[PDB]
Amino acid sequence: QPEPDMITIFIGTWNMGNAPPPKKITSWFLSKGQGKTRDDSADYIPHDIYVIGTQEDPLSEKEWLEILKHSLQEITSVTFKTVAIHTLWNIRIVVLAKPEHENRISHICTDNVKTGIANTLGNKGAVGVSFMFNGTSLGFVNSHLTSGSEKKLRRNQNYMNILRFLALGDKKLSPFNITHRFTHLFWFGDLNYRVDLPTWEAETIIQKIKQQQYADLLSHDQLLTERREQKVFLHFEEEEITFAPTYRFERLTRDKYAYTKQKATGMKYNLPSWCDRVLWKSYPLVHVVCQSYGSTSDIMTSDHSPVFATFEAGVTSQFVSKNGPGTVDSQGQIEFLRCYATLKTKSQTKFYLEFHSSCLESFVKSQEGENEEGSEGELVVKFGETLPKLKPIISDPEYLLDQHILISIKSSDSDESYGEGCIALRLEATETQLPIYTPLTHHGELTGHFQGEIKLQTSQ
Numbered sequence: 228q229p230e231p232d233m234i235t236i237f238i239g240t241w242n243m244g245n246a247p248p249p250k251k252i253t254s255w256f257l258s259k260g261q262g263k264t265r266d267d268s269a270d271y272i273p274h275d276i277y278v279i280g281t282q283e284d285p286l287s288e289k290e291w292l293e294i295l296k297h298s299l300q301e302i303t304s305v306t307f308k309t310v311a312i313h314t315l316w317n318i319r320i321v322v323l324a325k326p327e328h329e330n331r332i333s334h335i336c337t338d339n340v341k342t343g344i345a346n347t348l349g350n351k352g353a354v355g356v357s358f359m360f361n362g363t364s365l366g367f368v369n370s371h372l373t374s375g376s377e378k379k380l381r382r383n384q385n386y387m388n389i390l391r392f393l394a395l396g397d398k399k400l401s402p403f404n405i406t407h408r409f410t411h412l413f414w415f416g417d418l419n420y421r422v423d424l425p426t427w428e429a430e431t432i433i434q435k436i437k438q439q440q441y442a443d444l445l446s447h448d449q450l451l452t453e454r455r456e457q458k459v460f461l462h463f464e465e466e467e468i469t470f471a472p473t474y475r476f477e478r479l480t481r482d483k484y485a486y487t488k489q490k491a492t493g494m495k496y497n498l499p500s501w502c503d504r505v506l507w508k509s510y511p512l513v514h515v516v517c518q519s520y521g522s523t524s525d526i527m528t529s530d531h532s533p534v535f536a537t538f539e540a541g542v543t544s545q546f547v548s549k550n551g552p553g554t555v556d557s558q559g560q561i562e563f564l565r566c567y568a569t570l571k572t573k574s575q576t577k578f579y580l581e582f583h584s585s586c587l588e589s590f591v592k593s594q595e596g597e598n599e600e601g602s603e604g605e606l607v608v609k610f611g612e613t614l615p616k617l618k619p620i621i622s623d624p625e626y627l628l629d630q631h632i633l634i635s636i637k638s639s640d641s642d643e644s645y646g647e648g649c650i651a652l653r654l655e656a657t658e659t660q661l662p663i664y665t666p667l668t669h670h671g672e673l674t675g676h677f678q679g680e681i682k683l684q685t686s687q
């Protein structure tokens with residue numbers, strides 16, 4: 228039985244509005260409704276992994292697991308295995324996988340982050356799950372961010388707290404937050420960003436939605452505008468939105484948006500908005516293709532509609548050779564030529580690099596770089612030809628060209644990372660000097676760049 232080099236992943240996000248679900252929710256898992264929808268000819272084909280995020284979920288874990296598993300069994304005639312379930316307050320994540328994947332899945336990690344302080348601590352935050360699928364690391368974050376049209380900055384702050392403090396993946400990757408720990412990271416939830424138009428325009432917005440004319444609404448979506456201004460979700464991707472706003476509906480129909488201020492809303496308007504979203508970030512040059520992104524039309528218990536997204540995702544096998552794992556393979560090496568970091572910092576410590584990769588027995592520390600002044604004010608840290616030669620565990624190009632090197636640039640004075648990035652080994656050539664590049668971030672914000680040349684030796 229061959230190991231896969233692709234899987235499909237279902238992501239769902241649903242703010243249930245504290246109400247039990249209706250008796251049938253299969254349209255959600257079938258990617259049927261509005262937006263980019265899944266072909267009918269695929270209905271019986273199970274996804275490999277289903278990741279379900281709920282917010283305002285009133286059910287026990289047991290109650291929801293029974294609904295989810297029976298829903299998938301009805302669709303696919305497969306009894307899915309439960310990989311993980313984690314709940315913070317009424318924010319929940321469930322991971323289900325086809326039984327054939329049970330021995331391919333390992334290193335399962337769950338965590339949560341509570342956002343806010345005092346007033347603002349007690350119902351918002353995030354849950355997450357990570358695991359290995361053969362040679363590929365997968366992370367999944369379900370967040371419920373701060374509500375209200377005039378709180379986009381609080382949402383951005385919530386995002387940064389979650390990516391700093393959610394403890395998923397390989398704890399040996401100490402300099403790296405969740406935005407660098409996974410081959411594929413999916414971040415979804417009730418992110419609660421709104422369409423920023425005047426309240427007086429509510430009926431105009433509703434008109435536009437009835438005409439399926441979303442362009443003038445999406446141009447005011449706060450998540451798209453904040454992302455374009457690099458205020459949040461830097462280096463994440465989102466499929467184009469082609470479904471109606473998923474909030475705020477009158478319950479038991481989808482015919483009416485309920486936007487007017489009420490005591491129950493704290494006297495706040497809820498203009499129709501794309502609160503419910505799926506984003507992802509994958510390592511450079513790894514296959515990831517969104518195959519659906521939409522909302523259901525027939526699940527009406529909540530004031531939100533469920534959102535679905537599906538993905539093809541490249542995966543690799545758990546590689547064994549006659550040498551590594553358990554030793555190096557002298558036929559493999561990774562060299563860096565003419566490398567330099569450009570940093571936005573005003574500080575003047577010496578810096579060194581750390582190279583982290585599951586193709587190395589352990590991480591590698593460089594010598595300190597040489598600091599120079601850039602012509603536009605910047606710190607340039609030069610490594611020249613001084614970077615250590617990296618010794619991979621396996622030299623076979625079928626393995627090595629699918630790997631990635633994480634880079635942290637650290638202060639010699641404090642050993643704190645000033646920037647993190649990632650370099651793909653999926654090169655155009657081996658034994659050839661080739662340009663490399665990554666942006667550097669710290670706490671998910673841009674802090675600089677790393678560029679230079681690489682030379683990769685494989686056994687071929």
Ligand SMILES: Clc1cccc(CN2CCOCC2)c1
Pocket residue numbers: 308309310311324328329330331332333335
């Ligand atoms: Cl699908 C799945 C569900 C629950 C746990 C696991 C991890 N496994 C790996 C091998 O079997 C034992 C534990 C996988």
